[PDB]
Structure 1
Amino acid sequence: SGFRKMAFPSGKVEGCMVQVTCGTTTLNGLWLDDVVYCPRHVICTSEDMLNPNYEDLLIRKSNHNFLVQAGNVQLRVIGHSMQNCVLKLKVDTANPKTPKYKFVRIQPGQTFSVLACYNGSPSGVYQCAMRPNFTIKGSFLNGSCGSVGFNIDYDCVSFCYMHHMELPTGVHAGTDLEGNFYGPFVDRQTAQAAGTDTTITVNVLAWLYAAVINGDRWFLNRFTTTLNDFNLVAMKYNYEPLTQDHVDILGPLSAQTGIAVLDMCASLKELLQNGMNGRTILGSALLEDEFTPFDVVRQCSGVTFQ
């Protein structure tokens, strides 16, 4: 028993992190097979970042200007190209530690693990969610760009995020590994503000099931509701509308606990309208929304990765 915010084991990704330097700028890169992926703003100065013309800035760069270091050992760059907002640096050595991997573009509401790195070196690992406004709430300092987010299924690493930017409001924006930003954000130091940070309703419900499985049940009540009735309350509290697709996804947790999804929705409705009254659920005084239904099933059943 016990339910914790849990990241994937990070060893498979640790062996892919390198340092990339272009001029005065150092950040992180991801070394898979004979390609190193990194944010294209490695080629910028701090001045450049206000209005960068990346195509023009890259004309002045040659292979030998990209210094790529894996631990203490230097990699030889034999080609470079820009794909959307990432650079692909072709090196003459395939990463011998390359795991089985895929590139995936995740949907808002899905979760992933971040390996925070500096100077190509891992600093820590934590769990994140792609928010409905396409930001993530991470922990990133200067030098952390190029840190990646990922999920693992058995022995295959699905890379879904690369870190690029911090907004003035303290939240974070980045791309998939094809270099396309999540949401409307751009790699320019400008006025770009995040939209409404809505709560991921299906994840809150999954976490309430996790609470019941682990013995926290004070919030269960005698009520039920309907999708349309619940969603009137969801809207008031900036919760994402619950759909029949979401109900179906919660089916397995419903079956295990014997609590119908709409009954749990009625529990959530009362929690939103009345608050916690100073009580806690799984050690939290907030309704947690960065556990997916699949996260809960996985942790409550103890699946592993080889």
Structure 2
Amino acid sequence: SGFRKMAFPSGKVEGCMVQVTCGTTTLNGLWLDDVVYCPRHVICTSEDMLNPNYEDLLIRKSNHNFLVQAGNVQLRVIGHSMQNCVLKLKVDTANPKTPKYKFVRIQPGQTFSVLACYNGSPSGVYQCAMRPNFTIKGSFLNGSCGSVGFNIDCVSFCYMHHMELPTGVHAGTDLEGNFYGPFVDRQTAQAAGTDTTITVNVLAWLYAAVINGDRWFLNRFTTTLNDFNLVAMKYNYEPLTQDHVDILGPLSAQTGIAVLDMCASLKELLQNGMNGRTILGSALLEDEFTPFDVVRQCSGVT
């Protein structure tokens, strides 16, 4: 029993973190085989950030301009290139701790663990979701750029941290250097757009609450997908698709509660509130557990 925000074990990722310095900037890099990946904005001075020509700025750098440190060992850079917004530094030593891995781009609503790092040293691990507005509500300070997000499916790397937006939420890229969301690595006015609640995840968490014995919000009613979606739109919740109904299938089978029966519970909670009650100890409807996160935690997958 119990239900917590749970991250994946981080050991396989810890052994990949290094420190990358270019000029006066120090941030984190990811060392896999003989390549170190980090944000390409490490090559910019503050003035370069206003209107950077990354191709020209990178042409002006030499391999020597990048200092890479793995613990107390200097790794010699022998080549440099960019892929989208990620800098790739070829080094003279392959990481002997490289795990089996893939680079995976995730979709909004999906969760991942973040290994927050500073000076190439792992500091902490927490769980996040990619919001519908393509930001993440992380916990990061100056020096955290290059920290990564991942799932274990093989380590699937899905996020590299690049910047904090004015509301204090975060923006970054996949490990192929493609930003999540309409954000750029240039100093210009950027902002998080209006966000919405991840409906399929709230339904997954209501299933977690039922598995854990919390059933007060169940009722005799059902709804249709059309009627439910009209309510979701009114309350700033993402539309529920038939694919979301199918992904909730395993949790619906384990509890015996049809997805449209659970939608009638969620419709009533949105229209009436909780009446002073809590669900899994929360007074808010939680949306950062996917259906797979609930199955992983309630079944003890290792």
- Normalising by structure 1, report the TM-score: 0.97
Deviation per CA, 1:20-65, whole angstroms, max 9, x where unpaired? 0000000000000000000001011223222222112112210011
User: Which deviates further from its counterpart, 121-130 or 49-58?
Assistant: 49-58
Shift of 1:186: 0.3
**For the residues of structure 1 that align with 2:211 and 2:35, how far apart are their CA atoms?**
44
1:194 to partner: Cα distance: 1.9
Aligned length: 302
Deviation by residue 1:144-183 (Cα, 9 ceiling, x = unmatched): 000000000xx71000000001111111110000001011
Q: 1:224, CA displacement in angstroms?
A: 1.0
SS in 1 for 2:188: coil
Question: What SS class does the counterpart of residue 124 from structure 2 fall into?
Answer: strand
Within 2, Cα distance between the matches of 1:209 and 1:165? 35
Q: Which is worse superposed, 199-208 or 56-65?
A: 56-65
Distance 1:279 1:174 in 2: 37
**Alignment pair present for 1:20 and 2:20:** yes
1:96 aligns with 2:101: no
> Could you tell me how far 1:70 is from its partner in structure 2?
0.3
In structure 2, distance between residues paired with 1:189 and 1:6:
35
Superposition deviation, residue 78 in structure 1: 0.4
Q: Distance in 2 between matches of 1:301 and 1:177?
A: 30
Hey, what's the Cα distance between the residues in 2 that align with 1:188 and 1:169? 18
CA distance in 2, matches of 1:20, 1:222: 59
Computed over aligned residues only, the root mean square deviation of the Cα atoms, in angstroms, reads 0.9
Structure 2 unmatched ranges of 5 or more: none
SS of the residue 2:253 aligns to: helix
C-alpha distance in structure 1 between counterparts of 2:219 and 2:188, whole Å? 48
Alpha-carbon separation, structure 1, partners of 2:171 and 2:55 = 22
Gaps of 5+ in 1: none
Listed one character per residue, the Cα deviations across residues 181-226 of structure 1 (whole Å, up to 9, x for unaligned) are 0111001121112222111100100000000000111111121111
1:72 aligned partner: 72
- In structure 1, what is the Cα distance between the partners aligned to 2:185 and 2:191? 13
Distance between the aligned counterparts of 2:127 and 2:112, measured in 1?
A: 6
Find the aligned partners of 1:299 and 1:291 in 2 and give their Cα distance: 10
- Give distance in 1, aligned partners of 2:188 and 2:237: 29
Question: What is the alpha-carbon distance in structure 1 between the residues aligned to residue 245 and residue 85 of structure 2?
Answer: 36
Deviations 1:124-160 (A, max 9, x none): 00001111111111011110000000000xx710000
State the secondary structure of the residue aligned to 2:232: helix
Q: Distance in 1 between matches of 2:15 and 2:47?
A: 33
How far apart, in 2, do the equivalents of 1:191 and 1:277 lie?
41
- The residue number in structure 2 matching 1:131 is 131
* Correspondences of 1:258-273 after superposition (within 5 Å): 258-273=256-271
CA distance in 1, matches of 2:59, 2:271: 58
Deviations 1:238-287 (A, max 9, x none): 11111111111111111111111111001001111111122111121111
SS at 1:231's partner residue? Answer: helix
SS in 1 for 2:209: helix
- Compute the displacement of 1:302 (Å): 0.2
Q: CA deviation at 1:230?
A: 0.4
Cα deviation digits, residues 58-93 of structure 1 (max 9, x gap) = 122100110000011110110000111010000011
Q: Determine the C-alpha separation between the residues in 1 that align with 2:164 and 2:55.
A: 23
Distance in 2 (CA, whole Å) between partners of 1:57 and 1:157 is: 32
| Secondary structure of 1:160 counterpart | strand
| SS at 1:56 equivalent | helix
Q: TM-score, normalised on structure 2?
A: 0.98
Q: Distance in 2 between matches of 1:41 and 1:242?
A: 37
Aligned-partner Cα distance in 1 for 2:70–2:46: 25
SS in 1 for 2:250: helix
SS in 2 for 1:52: coil
**SS class of match (1:49):** helix
Residues 168-247 of structure 1 mapped to structure 2, 5 A cutoff: 168-247=166-245
